[PDB]
Coordinates of C-alpha atoms and ligand atoms in Angstrom, one line a residue:
Chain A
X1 CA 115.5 132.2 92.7
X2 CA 114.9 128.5 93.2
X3 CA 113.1 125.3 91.8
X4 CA 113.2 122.5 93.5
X5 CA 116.3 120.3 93.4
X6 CA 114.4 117.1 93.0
X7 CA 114.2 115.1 90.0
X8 CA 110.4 115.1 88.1
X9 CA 109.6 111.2 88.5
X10 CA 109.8 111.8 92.3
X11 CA 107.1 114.9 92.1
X12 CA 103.5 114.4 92.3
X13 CA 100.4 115.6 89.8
X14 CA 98.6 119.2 91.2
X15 CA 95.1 117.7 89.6
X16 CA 95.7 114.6 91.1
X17 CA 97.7 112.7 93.5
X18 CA 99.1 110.9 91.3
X19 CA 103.3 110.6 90.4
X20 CA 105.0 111.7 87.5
X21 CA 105.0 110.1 84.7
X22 CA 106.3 111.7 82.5
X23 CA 106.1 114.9 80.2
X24 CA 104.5 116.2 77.4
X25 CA 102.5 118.8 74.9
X26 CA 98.9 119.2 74.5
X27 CA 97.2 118.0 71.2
X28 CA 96.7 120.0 67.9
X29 CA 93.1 120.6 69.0
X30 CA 94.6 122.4 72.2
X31 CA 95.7 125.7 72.7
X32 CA 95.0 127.5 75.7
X33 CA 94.2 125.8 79.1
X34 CA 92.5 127.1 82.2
X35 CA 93.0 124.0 84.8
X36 CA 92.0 125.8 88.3
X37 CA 94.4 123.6 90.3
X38 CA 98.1 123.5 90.1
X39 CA 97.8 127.3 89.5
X40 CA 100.8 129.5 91.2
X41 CA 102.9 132.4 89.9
X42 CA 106.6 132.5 90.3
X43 CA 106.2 135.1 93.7
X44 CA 104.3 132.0 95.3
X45 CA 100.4 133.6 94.6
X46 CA 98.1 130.3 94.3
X47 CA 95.5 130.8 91.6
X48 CA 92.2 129.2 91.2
X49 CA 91.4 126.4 93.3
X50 CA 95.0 125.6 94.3
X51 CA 96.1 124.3 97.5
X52 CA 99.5 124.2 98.9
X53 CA 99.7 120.6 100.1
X54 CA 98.6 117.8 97.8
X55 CA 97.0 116.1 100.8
X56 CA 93.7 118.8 99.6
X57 CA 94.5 118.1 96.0
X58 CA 91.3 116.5 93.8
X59 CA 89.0 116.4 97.4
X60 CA 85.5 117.3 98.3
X61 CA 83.7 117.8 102.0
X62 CA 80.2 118.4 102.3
X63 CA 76.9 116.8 103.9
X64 CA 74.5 115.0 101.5
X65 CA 70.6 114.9 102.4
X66 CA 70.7 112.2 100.1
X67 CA 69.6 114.7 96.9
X68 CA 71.9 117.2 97.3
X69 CA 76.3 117.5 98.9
X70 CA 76.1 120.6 100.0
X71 CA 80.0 121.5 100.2
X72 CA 82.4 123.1 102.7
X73 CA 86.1 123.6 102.2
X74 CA 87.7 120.4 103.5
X75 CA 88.3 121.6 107.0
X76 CA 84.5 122.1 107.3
X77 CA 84.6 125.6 106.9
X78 CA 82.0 127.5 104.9
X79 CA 82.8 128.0 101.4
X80 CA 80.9 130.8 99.8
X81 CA 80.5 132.0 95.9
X82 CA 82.4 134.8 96.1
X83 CA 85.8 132.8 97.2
X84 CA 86.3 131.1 93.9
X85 CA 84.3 128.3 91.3
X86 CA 84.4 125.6 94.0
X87 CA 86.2 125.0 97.4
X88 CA 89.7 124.9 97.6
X89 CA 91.4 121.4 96.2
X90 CA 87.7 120.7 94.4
X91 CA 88.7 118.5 91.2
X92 CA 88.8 120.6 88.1
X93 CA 89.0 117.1 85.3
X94 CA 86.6 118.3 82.6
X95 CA 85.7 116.4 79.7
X96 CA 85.3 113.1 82.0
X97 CA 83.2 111.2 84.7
X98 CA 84.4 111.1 88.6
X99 CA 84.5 108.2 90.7
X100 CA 85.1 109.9 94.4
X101 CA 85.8 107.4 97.1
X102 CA 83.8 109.2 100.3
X103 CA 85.0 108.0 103.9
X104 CA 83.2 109.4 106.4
X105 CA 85.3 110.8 110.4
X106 CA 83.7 108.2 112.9
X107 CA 81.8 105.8 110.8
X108 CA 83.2 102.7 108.9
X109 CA 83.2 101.9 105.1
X110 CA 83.9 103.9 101.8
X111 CA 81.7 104.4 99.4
X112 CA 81.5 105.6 95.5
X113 CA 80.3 108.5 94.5
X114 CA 79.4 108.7 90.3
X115 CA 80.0 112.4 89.2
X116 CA 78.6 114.0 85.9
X117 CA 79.8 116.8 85.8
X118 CA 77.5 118.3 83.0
X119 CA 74.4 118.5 84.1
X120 CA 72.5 121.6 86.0
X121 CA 72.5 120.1 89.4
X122 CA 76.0 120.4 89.6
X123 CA 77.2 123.5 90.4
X124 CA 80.2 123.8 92.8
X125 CA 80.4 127.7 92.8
X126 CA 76.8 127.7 94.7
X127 CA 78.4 125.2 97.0
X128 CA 76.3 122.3 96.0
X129 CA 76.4 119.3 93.6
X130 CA 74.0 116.2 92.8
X131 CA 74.1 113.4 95.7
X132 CA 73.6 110.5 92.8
X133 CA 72.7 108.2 95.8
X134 CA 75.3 109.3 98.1
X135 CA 73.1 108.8 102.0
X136 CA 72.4 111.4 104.1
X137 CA 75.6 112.3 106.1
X138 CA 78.8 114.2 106.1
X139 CA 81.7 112.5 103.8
X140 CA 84.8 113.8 102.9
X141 CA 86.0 112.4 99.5
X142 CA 88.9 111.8 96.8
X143 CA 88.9 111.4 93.2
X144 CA 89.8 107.5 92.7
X145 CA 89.3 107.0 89.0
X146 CA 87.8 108.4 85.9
X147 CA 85.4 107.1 82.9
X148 CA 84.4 109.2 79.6
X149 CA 81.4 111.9 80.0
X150 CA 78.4 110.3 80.3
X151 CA 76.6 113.3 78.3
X152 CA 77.4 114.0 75.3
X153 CA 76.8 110.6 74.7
X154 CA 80.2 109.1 72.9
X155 CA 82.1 111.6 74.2
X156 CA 85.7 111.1 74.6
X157 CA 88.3 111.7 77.6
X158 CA 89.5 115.2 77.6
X159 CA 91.5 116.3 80.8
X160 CA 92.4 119.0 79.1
X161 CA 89.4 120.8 79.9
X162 CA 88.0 121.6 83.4
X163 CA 84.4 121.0 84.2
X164 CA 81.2 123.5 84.3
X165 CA 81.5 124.7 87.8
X166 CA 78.2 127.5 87.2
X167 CA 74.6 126.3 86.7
X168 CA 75.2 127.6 83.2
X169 CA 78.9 127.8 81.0
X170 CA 77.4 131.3 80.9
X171 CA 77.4 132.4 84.6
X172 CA 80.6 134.0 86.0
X173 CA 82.4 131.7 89.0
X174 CA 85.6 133.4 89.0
X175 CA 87.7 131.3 86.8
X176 CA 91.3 131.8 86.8
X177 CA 92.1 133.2 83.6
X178 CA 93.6 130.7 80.7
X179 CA 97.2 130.1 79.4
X180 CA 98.3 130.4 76.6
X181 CA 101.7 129.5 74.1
X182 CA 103.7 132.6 74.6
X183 CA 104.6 132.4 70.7
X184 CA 107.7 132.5 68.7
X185 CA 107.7 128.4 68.2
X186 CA 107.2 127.7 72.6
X187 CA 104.7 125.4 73.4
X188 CA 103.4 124.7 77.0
X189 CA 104.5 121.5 78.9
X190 CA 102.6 119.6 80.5
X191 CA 103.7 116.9 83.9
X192 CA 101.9 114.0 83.1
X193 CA 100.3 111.2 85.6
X194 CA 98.5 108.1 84.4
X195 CA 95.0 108.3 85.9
X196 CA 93.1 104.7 86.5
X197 CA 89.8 103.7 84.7
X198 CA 88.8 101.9 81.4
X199 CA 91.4 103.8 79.0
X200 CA 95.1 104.7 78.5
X201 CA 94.4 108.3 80.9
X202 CA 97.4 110.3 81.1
X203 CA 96.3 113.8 83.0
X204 CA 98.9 116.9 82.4
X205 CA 99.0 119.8 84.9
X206 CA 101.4 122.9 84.3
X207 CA 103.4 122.3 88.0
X208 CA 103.9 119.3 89.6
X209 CA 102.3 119.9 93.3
X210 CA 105.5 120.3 95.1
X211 CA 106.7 123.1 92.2
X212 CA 103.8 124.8 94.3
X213 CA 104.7 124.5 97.5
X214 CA 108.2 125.4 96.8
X215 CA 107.4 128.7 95.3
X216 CA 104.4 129.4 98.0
X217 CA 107.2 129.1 100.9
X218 CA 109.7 130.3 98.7
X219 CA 107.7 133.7 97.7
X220 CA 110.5 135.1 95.6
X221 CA 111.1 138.5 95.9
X222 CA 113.1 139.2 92.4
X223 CA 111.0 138.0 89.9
X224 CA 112.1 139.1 86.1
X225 CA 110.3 138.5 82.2
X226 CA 111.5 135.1 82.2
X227 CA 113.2 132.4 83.6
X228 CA 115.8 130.3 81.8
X229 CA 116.2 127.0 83.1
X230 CA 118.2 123.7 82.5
X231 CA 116.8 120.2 82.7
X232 CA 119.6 118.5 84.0
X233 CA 121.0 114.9 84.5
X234 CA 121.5 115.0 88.5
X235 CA 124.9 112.3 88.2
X236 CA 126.6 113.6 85.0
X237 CA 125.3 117.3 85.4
X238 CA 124.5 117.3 81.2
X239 CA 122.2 120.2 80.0
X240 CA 119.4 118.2 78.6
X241 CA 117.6 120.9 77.3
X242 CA 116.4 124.6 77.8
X243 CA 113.5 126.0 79.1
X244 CA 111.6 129.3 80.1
X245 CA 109.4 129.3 83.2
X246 CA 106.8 132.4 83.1
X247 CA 105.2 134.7 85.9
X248 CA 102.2 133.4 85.9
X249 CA 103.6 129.6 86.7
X250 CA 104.1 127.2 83.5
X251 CA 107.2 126.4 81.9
X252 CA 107.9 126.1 77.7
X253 CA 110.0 124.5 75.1
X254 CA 110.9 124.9 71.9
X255 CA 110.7 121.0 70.2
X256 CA 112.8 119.9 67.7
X257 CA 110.7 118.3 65.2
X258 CA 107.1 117.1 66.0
X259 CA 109.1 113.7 67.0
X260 CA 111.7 115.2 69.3
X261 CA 110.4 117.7 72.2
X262 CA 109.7 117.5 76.0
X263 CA 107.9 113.8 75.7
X264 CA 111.2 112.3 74.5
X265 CA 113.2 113.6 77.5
X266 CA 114.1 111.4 80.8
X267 CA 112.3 111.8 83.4
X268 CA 114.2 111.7 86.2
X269 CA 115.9 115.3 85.2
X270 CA 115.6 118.1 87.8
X271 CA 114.9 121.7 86.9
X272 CA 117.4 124.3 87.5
X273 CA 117.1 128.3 87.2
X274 CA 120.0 129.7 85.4
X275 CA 118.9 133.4 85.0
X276 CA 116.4 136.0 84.4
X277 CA 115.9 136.9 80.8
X278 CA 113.9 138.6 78.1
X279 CA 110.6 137.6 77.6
X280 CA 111.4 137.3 73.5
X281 CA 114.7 135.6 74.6
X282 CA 115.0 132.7 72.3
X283 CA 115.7 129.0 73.5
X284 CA 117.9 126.6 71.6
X285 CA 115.1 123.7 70.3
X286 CA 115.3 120.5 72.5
Chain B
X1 CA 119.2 126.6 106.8
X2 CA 115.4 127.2 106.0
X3 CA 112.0 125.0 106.6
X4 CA 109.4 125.7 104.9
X5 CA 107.7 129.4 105.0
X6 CA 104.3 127.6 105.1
X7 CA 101.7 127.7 108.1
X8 CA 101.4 124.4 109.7
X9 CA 97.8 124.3 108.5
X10 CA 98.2 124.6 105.2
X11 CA 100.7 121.3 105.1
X12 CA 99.9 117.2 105.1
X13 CA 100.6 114.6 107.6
X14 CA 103.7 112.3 106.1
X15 CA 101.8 108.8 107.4
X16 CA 98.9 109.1 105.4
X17 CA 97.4 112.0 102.9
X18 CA 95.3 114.4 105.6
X19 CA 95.7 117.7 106.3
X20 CA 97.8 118.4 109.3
X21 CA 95.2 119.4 111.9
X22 CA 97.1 120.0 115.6
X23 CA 100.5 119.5 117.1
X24 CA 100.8 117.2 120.1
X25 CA 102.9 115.0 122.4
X26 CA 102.9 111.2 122.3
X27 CA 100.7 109.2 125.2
X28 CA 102.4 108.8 128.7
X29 CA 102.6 104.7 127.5
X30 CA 104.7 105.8 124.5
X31 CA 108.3 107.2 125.1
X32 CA 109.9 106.0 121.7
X33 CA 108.5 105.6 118.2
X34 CA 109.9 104.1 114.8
X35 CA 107.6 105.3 112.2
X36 CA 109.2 104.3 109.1
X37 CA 107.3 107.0 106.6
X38 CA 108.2 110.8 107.3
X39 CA 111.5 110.3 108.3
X40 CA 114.2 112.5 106.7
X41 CA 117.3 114.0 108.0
X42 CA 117.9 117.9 108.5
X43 CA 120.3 117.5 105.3
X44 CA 117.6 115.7 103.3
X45 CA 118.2 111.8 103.5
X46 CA 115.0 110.3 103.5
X47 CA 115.2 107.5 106.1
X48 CA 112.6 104.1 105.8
X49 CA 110.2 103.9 103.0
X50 CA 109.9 107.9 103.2
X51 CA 109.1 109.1 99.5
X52 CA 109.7 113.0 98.7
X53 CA 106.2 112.7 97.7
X54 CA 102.8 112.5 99.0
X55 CA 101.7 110.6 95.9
X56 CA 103.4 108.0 96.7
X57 CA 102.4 108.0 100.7
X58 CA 100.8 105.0 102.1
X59 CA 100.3 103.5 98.6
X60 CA 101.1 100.1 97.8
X61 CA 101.2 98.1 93.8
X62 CA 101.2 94.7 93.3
X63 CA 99.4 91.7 91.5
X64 CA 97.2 89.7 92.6
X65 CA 97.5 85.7 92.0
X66 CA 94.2 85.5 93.9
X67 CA 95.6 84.0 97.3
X68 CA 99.2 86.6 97.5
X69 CA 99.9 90.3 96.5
X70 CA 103.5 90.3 95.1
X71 CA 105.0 93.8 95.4
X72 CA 107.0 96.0 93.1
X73 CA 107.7 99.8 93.9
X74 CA 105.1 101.9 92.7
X75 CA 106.1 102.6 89.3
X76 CA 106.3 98.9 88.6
X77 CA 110.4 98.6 89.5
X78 CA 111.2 95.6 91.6
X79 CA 111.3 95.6 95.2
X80 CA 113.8 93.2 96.8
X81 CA 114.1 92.2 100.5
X82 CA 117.8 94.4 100.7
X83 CA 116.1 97.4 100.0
X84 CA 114.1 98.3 103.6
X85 CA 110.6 96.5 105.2
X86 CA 108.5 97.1 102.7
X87 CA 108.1 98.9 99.2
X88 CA 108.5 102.9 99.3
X89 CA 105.5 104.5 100.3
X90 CA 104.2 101.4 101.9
X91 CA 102.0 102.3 104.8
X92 CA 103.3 102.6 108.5
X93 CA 100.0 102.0 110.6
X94 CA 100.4 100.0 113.0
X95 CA 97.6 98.9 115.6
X96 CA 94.3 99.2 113.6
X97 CA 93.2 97.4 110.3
X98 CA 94.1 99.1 106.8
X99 CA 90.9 99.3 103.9
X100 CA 92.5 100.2 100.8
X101 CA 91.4 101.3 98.1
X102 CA 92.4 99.3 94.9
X103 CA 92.2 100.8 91.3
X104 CA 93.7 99.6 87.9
X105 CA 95.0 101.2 84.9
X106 CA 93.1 100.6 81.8
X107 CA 90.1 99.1 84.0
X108 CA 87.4 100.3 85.5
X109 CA 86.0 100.2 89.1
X110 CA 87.5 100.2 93.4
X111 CA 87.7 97.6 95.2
X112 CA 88.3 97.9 99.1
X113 CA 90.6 95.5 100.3
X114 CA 90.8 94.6 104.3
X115 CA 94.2 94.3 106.0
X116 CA 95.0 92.5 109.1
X117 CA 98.9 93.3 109.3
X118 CA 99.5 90.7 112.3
X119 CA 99.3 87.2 110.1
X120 CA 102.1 85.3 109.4
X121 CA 100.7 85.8 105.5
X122 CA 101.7 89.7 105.9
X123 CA 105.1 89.9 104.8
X124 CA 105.7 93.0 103.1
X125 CA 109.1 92.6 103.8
X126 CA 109.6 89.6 101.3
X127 CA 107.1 91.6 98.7
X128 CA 104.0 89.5 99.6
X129 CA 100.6 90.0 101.5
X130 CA 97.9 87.8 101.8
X131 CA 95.1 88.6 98.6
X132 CA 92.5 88.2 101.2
X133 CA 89.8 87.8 98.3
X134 CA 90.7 90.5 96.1
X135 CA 91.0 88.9 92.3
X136 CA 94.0 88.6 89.9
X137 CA 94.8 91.6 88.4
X138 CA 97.4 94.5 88.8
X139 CA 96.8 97.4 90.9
X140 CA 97.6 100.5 92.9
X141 CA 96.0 100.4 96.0
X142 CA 96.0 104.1 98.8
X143 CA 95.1 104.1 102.5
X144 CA 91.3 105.2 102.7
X145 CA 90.1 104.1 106.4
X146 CA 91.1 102.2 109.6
X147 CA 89.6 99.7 112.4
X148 CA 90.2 97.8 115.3
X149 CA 93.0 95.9 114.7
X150 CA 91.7 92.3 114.1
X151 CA 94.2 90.7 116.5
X152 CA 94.5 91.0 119.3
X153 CA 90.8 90.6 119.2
X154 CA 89.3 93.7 121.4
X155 CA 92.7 95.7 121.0
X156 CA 91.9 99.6 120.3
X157 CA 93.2 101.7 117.7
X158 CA 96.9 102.6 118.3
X159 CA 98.6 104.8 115.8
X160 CA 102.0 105.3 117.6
X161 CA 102.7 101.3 116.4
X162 CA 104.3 100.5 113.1
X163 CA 103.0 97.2 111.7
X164 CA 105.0 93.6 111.8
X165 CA 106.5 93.9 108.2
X166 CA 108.5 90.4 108.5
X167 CA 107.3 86.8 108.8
X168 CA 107.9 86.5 112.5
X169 CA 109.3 89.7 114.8
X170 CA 111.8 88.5 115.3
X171 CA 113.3 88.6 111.2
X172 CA 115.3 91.3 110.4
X173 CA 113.7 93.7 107.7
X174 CA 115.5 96.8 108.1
X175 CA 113.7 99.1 110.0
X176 CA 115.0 102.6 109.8
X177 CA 115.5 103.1 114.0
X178 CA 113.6 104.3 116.9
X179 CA 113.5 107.9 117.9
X180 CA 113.8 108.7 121.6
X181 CA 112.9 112.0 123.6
X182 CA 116.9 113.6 124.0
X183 CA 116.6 114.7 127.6
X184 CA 116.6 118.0 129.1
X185 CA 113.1 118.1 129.9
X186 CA 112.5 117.9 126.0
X187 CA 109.4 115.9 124.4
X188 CA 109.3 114.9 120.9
X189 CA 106.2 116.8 119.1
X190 CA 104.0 115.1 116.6
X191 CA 102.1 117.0 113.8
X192 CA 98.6 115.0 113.8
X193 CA 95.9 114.1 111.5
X194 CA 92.2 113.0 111.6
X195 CA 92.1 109.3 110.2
X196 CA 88.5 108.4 108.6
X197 CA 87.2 105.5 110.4
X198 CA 84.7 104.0 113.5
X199 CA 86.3 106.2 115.8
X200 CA 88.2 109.3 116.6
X201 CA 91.6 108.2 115.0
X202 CA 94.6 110.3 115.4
X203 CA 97.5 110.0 112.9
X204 CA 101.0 111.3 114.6
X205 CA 103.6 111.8 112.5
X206 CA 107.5 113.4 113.1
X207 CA 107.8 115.6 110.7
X208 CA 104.8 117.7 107.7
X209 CA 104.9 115.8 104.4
X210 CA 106.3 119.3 102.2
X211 CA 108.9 119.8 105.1
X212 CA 110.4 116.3 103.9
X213 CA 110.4 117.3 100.2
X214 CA 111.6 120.7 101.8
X215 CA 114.9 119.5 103.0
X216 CA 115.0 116.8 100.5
X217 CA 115.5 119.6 97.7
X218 CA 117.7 122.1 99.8
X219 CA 120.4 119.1 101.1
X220 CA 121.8 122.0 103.7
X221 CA 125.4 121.9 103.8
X222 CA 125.6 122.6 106.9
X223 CA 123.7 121.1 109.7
X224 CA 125.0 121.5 113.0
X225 CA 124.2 120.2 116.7
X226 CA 120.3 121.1 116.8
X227 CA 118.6 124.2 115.3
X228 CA 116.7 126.5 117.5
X229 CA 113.5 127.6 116.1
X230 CA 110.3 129.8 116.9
X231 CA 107.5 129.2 116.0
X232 CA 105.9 131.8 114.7
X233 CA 102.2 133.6 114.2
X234 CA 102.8 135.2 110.6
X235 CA 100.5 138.6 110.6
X236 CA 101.4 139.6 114.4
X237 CA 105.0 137.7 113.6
X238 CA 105.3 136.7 117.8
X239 CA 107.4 134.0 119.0
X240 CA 104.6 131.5 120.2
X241 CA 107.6 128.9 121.2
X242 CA 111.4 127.9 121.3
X243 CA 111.6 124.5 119.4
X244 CA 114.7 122.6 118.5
X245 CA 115.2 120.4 114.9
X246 CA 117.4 117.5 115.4
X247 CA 119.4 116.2 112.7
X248 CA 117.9 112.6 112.7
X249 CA 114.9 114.9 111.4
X250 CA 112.7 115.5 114.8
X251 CA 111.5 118.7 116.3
X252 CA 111.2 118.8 120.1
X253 CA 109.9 121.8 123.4
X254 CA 109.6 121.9 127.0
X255 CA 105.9 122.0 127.8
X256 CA 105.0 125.0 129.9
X257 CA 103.6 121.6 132.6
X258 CA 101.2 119.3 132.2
X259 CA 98.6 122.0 131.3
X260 CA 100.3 123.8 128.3
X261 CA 102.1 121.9 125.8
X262 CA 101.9 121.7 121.8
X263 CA 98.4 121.0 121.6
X264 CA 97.6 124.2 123.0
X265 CA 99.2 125.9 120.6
X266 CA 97.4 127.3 117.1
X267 CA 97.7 125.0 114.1
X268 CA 98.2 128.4 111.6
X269 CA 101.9 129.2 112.7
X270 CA 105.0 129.0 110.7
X271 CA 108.3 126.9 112.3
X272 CA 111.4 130.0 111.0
X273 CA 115.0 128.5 111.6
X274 CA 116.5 131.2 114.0
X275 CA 120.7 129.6 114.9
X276 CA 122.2 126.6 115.3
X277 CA 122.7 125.4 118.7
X278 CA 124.4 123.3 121.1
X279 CA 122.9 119.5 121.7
X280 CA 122.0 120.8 125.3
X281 CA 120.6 124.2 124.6
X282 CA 118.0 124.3 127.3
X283 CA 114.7 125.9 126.0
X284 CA 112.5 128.3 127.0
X285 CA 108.9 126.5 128.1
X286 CA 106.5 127.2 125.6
X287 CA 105.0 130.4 125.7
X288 CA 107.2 132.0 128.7
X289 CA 109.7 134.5 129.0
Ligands
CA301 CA1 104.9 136.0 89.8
CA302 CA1 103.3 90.1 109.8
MG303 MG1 113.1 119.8 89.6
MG304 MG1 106.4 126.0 108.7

């Protein structure tokens, strides 16, 4: 079994296409996540809206009337409800406001599109969302920069959340499921990317995109409880910490100390699998 | 040796952030090219301002005085004349106009900024291009759309070009070096991308974005002459085509005539490393035998 042999800083988002910044954990307030991109198991099976190249990653396609975008995936094909909570690549930033740059195939100019997420127009899984003044035409676009919610009003920015992709939080549009802290003192890490717009936006995703890509070509036949992994210093080969990697595609640590964990690691380390082991098999804190 | 077990489809072009949409062969005017993005080496050295990453493809960062862009990398490092024609990442377009799309930490709002490359004011090279109206400020600008290239005035899109990234062209800037059809009735294959823009632009590019962070990662020990490949439909799993991989990082076939060449082949196949081979291996047309 393989990750790949390239260190973090030179790995991109899967939310966004944005690099590597750095590390970290989610807040107190956050326990389980259930982003919809930068989903893939260990075998290589993507989950959610995950694509394997980042060049989809964050993206919409569809034709306004100049109410309504009705969307396609981004090759044009038809998306339909039963494939998944939006097209493949759609962003999945909850707790925030979109600004989509839309370019258009055979016409000049960019233009941007304002996304609220929240309200009852939007709704992705039906394969349409809110024009917003967006002109009539066909426009494929790419999440350029964020702002807080516009409702509720005051809100702050949460990217740990993902948006409302149904009419209703109440109607089903095949989610995939949520992660959670395996126990026993691991916590989830998060790859950070610093996401422009009028605040210090750092946006965590549980595989950088090439992580992805790797394991979708790679479709590893031997797959065991866990994976115990190094993150090493590429020059002097030091063990600068250990981690587990789960089936279902997200890695833990165990900090040491609510000052010293993942966030207080290099960045420029590179994973490496070691071996299979237990699922209960206990890591040495960071 | 492996490439990626990933269907051509599915992958980006390494010039620019767009899905890869068709293989083809370069126009009858173009024999070499010297792209200086997606260019890496069988055994994983990335060549030019190649990143390993498509977040960093066809990006630039810089501040703004108001009249000049001075250039760092894209994390903020320095970039310094020694280290290649432009920042990593740095886009390769040559022949058309660029319209990039400028965003700031900490601030909100775009701004499109317009890019004539053929100024004596564009010199990437030394870390500076003209501001051409966009205000003081730090930010990280990415490709978003092309034109006609401003000068020559009336000249049409050409994608096959890289841009002047020195002063004059005649200053030095290091460009990593041209890549010329081998012989043996071989032609160099390009995996191309629709480019938004007043036209129907088409993006070539030598090698898929993940095929470069592919052989970045698995630095293959042992690269020899050329590798013979098939390319490959996954569900049926028929040889659609003898290719071969060079090391410089290029794939090449023999076009079965001027009728039946990459571009008639489907986009959804998978490239599967079958031996290394001799320089001169003589291939199969594609689709015969
Ligand atoms: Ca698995
Ligand atoms: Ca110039
Ligand atoms: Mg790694
Ligand atoms: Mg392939």
């Amino acid at each position: 079994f393989t990750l790949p042999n390239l260190p973090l800083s030179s790995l991109s988002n899967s939310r966004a296409p944005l690099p590597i910044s750095s590390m970290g954990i989610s807040p107190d307030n956050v326990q389980s996540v259930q982003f919809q991109n930068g989903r893939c198991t260990l075998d290589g099976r993507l989950v959610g809206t995950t694509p394997v190249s980042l060049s989809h990653v964050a993206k919409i396609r569809g034709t306004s009337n100049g109410t309504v975008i009705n969307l396609t995936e981004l090759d044009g094909t038809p998306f339909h409800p039963f494939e998944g909570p939006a097209p493949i690549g759609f962003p999945d930033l909850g707790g925030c406001d979109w600004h989509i740059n839309m370019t258009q195939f055979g016409h000049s100019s960019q233009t941007q599109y304002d996304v609220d997420t929240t309200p009852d127009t939007f709704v992705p899984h039906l394969g349409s969302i809110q024009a917003n003044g967006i002109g009539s035409g066909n426009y494929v676009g790419v999440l350029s920069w964020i702002s807080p919610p516009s409702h509720p009003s005051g809100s702050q920015v949460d990217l740990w959340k993902i948006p409302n992709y149904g009419s209703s939080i109440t109607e089903a549009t095949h989610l995939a499921p949520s992660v959670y802290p395996p126990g026993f003192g691991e916590v989830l890490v998060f790859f950070m990317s610093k996401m422009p717009g009028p605040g210090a936006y750092n946006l965590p995703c549980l595989l950088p995109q090439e992580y992805i890509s790797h394991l979708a070509s790679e479709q590893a036949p031997t797959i065991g409880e866990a994976a115990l992994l190094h993150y090493v210093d590429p020059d002097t080969g030091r063990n600068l910490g250990e981690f587990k990697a789960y089936p279902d595609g997200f890695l833990t640590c165990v900090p040491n100390g609510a000052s010293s964990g993942p966030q207080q690691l290099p960045i420029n380390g590179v994973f490496v699998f070691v071996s299979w082991v237990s699922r209960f098999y206990q890591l040495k804190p960071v």
